[PDB]
Amino acid sequence: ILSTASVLAFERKLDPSDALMSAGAWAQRDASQEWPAVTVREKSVRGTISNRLKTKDRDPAKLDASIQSPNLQTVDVANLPSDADTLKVRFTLRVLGGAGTPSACNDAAYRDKLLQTVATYVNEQGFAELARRYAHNLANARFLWRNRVGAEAVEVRINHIRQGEVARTWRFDALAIGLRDFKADAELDALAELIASGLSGSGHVLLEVVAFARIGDGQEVFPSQELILDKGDKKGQKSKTLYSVRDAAAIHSQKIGNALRTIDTWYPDEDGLGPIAVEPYGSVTSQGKAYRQPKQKLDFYTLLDNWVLRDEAPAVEQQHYVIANLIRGGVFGEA
Amino acid sequence: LSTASVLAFERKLDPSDALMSAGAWAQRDASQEWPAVTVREKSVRGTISNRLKTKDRDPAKLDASIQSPNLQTVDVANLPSDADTLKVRFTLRVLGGAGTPSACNDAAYRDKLLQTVATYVNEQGFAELARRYAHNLANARFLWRNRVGAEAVEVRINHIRQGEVARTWRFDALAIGLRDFKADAELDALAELIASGLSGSGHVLLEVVAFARIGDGQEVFPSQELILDKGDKKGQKSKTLYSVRDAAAIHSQKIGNALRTIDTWYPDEDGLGPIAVEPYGSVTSQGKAYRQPKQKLDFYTLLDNWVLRDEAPAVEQQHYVIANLIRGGVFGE
Amino acid sequence: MKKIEMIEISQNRQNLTAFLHISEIKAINAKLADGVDVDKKSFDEICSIVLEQYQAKQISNKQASEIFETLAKANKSFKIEKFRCSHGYNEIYKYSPDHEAYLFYCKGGQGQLNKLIAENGRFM
C-alpha cells in the first residue's frame, strides 16, 4: 500500500510584500512617514566590448576595429537623492499557519498519513527552531540583498500590527548578528515565539518590518530587476529595467521570501558556504550546484517518502528541513 | 416511462463578476470611491523543484539544469502600500421557479417532474436550501484564498428593491463558522428572503460586499485565466489574472461555487466540511468523487428513482436533488 | 460480471510490473490453470493469457470474474483517454498534457467521438 500522491501542492504559509524603498537621513529615521520614494531613472551607458575571445579571433587589427565602435545602452539606475544617506526598505509579512494540509492531493490515505506525520512532528518538537531561524533572517537584514553589503549601520524594526495599531516592537542592529551564526538573543526568542505561534495556528500574525541602511549620501541602491519583452522597435530598447510599483523602486516579494527562508545549514557540505535557502534538491543559482542531490540520501523527496510511506523518521535537523520546505510551499508532483 | 431525451434547467442563482477594490479599514462605510486593484505584471525566476523520474537524476544533469533557470513573467495583484483591506463586490439575483425545465422533450415526464418538485415544495419548501445559501453568503466563502489568514472579514448584504436599498444585513464572517450550519437570529431574515425569491414570490437581488482585512500592501488572489502556452521566449506570460475593465475580479462561477457549497449529506463523512452540489459530487482538490454511482446516492440515480419509480429518497437527500436542480444543466439523455 | 468488460479492463490500464502483492499471487497461481506462473509479469501479458484461457474454454466464468476483478482492484493507474465527451451538452474535449486538462475540441456526440477515436487512437 501507500504509493505517493500523483499530485501534491502546498500554499505559501509565509507571505511577504513588495518591499518599497524610500530615502532620508539618519537620526530622522524615527519619523520615517514622509520619506520620498527612490525613483528609477534612466541613464545612457557607453561600453567597449570586453568578452573573452577564441584563439581565431585574436587578430590585432580586428580587435582595434571592434573597440572603435561602442555598445550604447539605456540602462536604469536607482540612486538615493544627494541629500539623503539612509535607505528605508519596508514591507509586511503575514504568517498563515496550518503547514501540513495540502492544496491538492489525489490520494486519501497519503493525505491523512502526511497530516498525522506533521501533527506528531509539531507535538514532538514544535515550530520553535524554524521560527527562530526565520526570526534571525528577519533580524539580520538579509532581504537587503546588495543594499546591505558595504553599508555602515543597518537597523531593522519589526512591529506586530494586530488591530491596525502596533502591539509590540523589536529593534535590531543587523550587523552585530551576522549571516552565519545564529546567536539566539532575547528579543530574537520573543520574535521566535510569536512567529511560532503564528505558524502553529495559535493566532494570526502580521508583522510590519522596516530596514534602514546607512548606505551613504547619493549612492546607488539595488532594487530587483525585471526582464525584457523583445517585441516592437527592437533596436534602441531599454537594456535593463528595474522594478517599480507606482514609480517607487521595490524588491520583488519572492526575493524577500527567499531571503527569509535561508535557514538550512543541514545539507551535506554545511561548512564552507553557510546557510542556503530551503528547496527540494537544495540548490543555489549563484553557486550553480545542488547541495542535496538524489544520489545522496539527503533530498526532500527521498526524505518525505521515507518519512511518510516507510515510517522511518530522519534526524531532527532533516525533519526541520522537510517541514521547513513544506512551510515554503510549491507543487510536488511529476511534471 | 423513461427520462426525456432533452431536459435542461437554467441556473436559478445568478451572481455577477465579483470585482475587487482596495482601501483602508474603519473607513469602509464611505467606500464607493475606493480605487480598484489593478493587475500588474512582474517577473519571476523559478528553479527546478519537480520530481525527477530517476532518468535525469544524475550528478551532472541536475547541475546543468540548475544553472539554466526558468524565467517567467506572471501577472500579480496586490493592495497598495497605504491600503490594508480588500473590498469584493458583486450582485446575486435569485430567479425562482426551480423545478421547471427550460427545454423538455416529453410532456408526460415533465408533468410528473413538476408534480414531484411541487410535492417537495409544499411538503417542505426551500427554507433549508435558502438557509445554507444564506450561510454561504454570510460566511464569506466567495473570497476563496482572500479569506485565509485574514484578520477580520465583514459582509454587507443589501436588498436592492428598485434601486433603493430596502433591507440591510451586516455579518462578521469569521464569527460564524465555515463548517457548522448553525442558525442565527439575523441570518433567518436573509434565509427567508432567499426562500421567498426561490419560491416565486417577488424578485430578489442582493448586493454582497465583503471586506477582508488582509494587510498593508499584501497580495490578493483574483480569478486566474487560461493560457495556451505553446512556446515560451526568454520570459513569456505563464500566469494571467481576470480583470473586468482594468480592475481585478473573481469569475462569476467561482463565486457561484462558493455559494452552493452546501452538500453535507454525502455518505463518506459529514464531518469533513460541506462540498459543492454536483452530480457524482466531486472536488478536484481532493481528486476523488463522493456520491459514487456504484453506490445509489448520486444525483443521476436518485433523480430517476424519485421521478420514474417513485421511490422518494431520504429527506436530507431531496435537498441535494432540488439543489442540483437549482444549479442547472441538461439532465437526461 | 460481463465479458467485454474484462477485455476493456485488460486494454485500458497501465502496464505495471511488481504490482501483485503476496495474497493476490497466492490466490492466483493456485486459482488459475497449471500452465503459466505469473511472477514479475506485465499487466498486459497476465490479462492476455487469462483472456486466452477464458476463450479456449478450460476455466469457468466465475473464476475469471473474480480474478479480473482482482486485477481491477489491484491496479489504480489508468491510461488517459485523449477524448472525453460531454453527453447532454454535446461537446468533445481533448486532453492536452501541458495543461493537465481537457481542452475543448469540437461539437459532437458519440458518433463524432468514435470517428475521432478511430482516427487518432483511443489513448494518449
TrEMBL record, chain C:
It comes from the Viruses. This is Uncharacterized protein.
